[PDB]
Amino acid sequence: QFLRPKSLDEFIGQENVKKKLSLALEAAKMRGEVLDHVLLAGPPGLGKTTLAHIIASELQTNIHVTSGPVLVKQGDMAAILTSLERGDVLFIDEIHRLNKAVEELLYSAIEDFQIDIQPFTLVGATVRSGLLSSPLRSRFGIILELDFYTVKELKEIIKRAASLMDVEIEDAAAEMIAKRSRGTPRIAIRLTKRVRDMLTVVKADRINTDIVLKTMEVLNIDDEGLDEFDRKILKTIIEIYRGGPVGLNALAASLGVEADTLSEVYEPYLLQAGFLARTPRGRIVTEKAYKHLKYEVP
Numbered sequence: 592q593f594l595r596p597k598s599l600d601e602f603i604g605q606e607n608v609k610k611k612l613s614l615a616l617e618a619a620k621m622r623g624e625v626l627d628h629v630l631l632a633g634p635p636g637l638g639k640t641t642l643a644h645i646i647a648s649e650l651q652t653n654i655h656v657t658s659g660p661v662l663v664k665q666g667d668m669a670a671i672l673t674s675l676e677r678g679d680v681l682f683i684d685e686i687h688r689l690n691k692a693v694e695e696l697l698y699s700a701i702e703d704f705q706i707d708i709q710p711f712t713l714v715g716a717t718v719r720s721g722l723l724s725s726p727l728r729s730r731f732g733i734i735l736e737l738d739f740y741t742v743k744e745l746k747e748i749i750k751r752a753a754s755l756m757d758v759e760i761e762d763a764a765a766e767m768i769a770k771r772s773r774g775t776p777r778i779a780i781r782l783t784k785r786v787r788d789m790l791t792v793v794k795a796d797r798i799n800t801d802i803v804l805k806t807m808e809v810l811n812i813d814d815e816g817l818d819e820f821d822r823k824i825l826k827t828i829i830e831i832y833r834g835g836p837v838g839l840n841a842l843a844a845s846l847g848v849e850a851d852t853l854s855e856v857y858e859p860y861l862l863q864a865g866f867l868a869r870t871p872r873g874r875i876v877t878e879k880a881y882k883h884l885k886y887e888v889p
């Protein structure tokens with residue numbers, strides 16, 4: 592966790608998110624009040640969990656980490672709720688996955704802090720806020736939508752990670768990794784770790800473009816940052832479904848993966864980067880996809 596930002600000042604990018612959260616956070620600390628409930632939404636690896644921890648640290652309260660799919664029976668939820676101290680942060684990742692039982696219980700503690708529960712701050716995280724129910728969603732006073740990071744922001748994150756790992760890196764090299772990070776800090780840091788391994792084995796003084804290219808070849812990451820499965824999704828649509836449109840369920844079954852993982856984990860970046868598009872009849876690949884994967888444009 593040595594690479595995990597401990598405060599907003601150490602959290603690169605997400606300017607709109609930071610200013611909104613900072614405003615609410617500072618104000619609450621100044622008044623000694625419990626912070627309004629916060630919902631963090633965006634694809635994986637963007638910093639939702641990191642922001643949840645930062646919120647508690649800034650408030651100087653304790654954070655209770657839990658997972659929606661974990662809270663099965665009301666007993667589990669009720670127990671966690673009663674363990675909360677005034678001002679504590681209850682962090683629920685994949686909160687939209689809470690069953691009606693534990694959800695209705697949680698909702699109750701939000702209306703009047705009684706199911707007596709100590710006033711606390713509910714911080715939920717989900718890949719997409721739309722997955723939450725109408726009731727629970729309207730209970731969040733602050734909703735922070737995180738989008739993919741820019742290449743410039745990612746480069747900054749990469750240089751920071753390199754420094755923390757005691758390794759020198761050239762700007763052009765950091766740029767190359769960032770361009771292949773699929774707009775995600777998690778990916779950018781893992782790629783940096785792997786590039787570090789290559790520097791180690793080739794005994795270099797610092798990471799350059801050559802070292803990065805060698806690493807990307809070993810990792811099978813192309814010039815667009817797409818990995819094996821990313822290409823597998825596009826190739827399946829192209830070859831089996833003639834480019835689409837293909838329904839999410841049909842596509843997921845052909846790939847042997849859950850539909851949720853496909854649409855919530857991999858599709859986001861592919862849509863953002865213009866390789867995929869969604870239509871009422873289903874997903875389709877774009878001309879950019881065909882060209883990039885060197886498939887004859889039908």
Ligand SMILES: Nc1ncnc2c1ncn2[C@@H]1O[C@H](COP(=O)(O)OP(=O)(O)O)[C@@H](O)[C@H]1O
Pocket residue numbers: 594595596601602603604605633634635636637638639640641642716748776777780
């Ligand atoms: N803005 C950022 N600056 C630096 N590192 C970041 C940032 N956002 C995320 N990370 C890093 O990426 C990893 C992924 O973050 P995490 O908060 O777990 O993502 P999420 O909960 O959205 O899946 C963490 O290692 C973290 O320390």
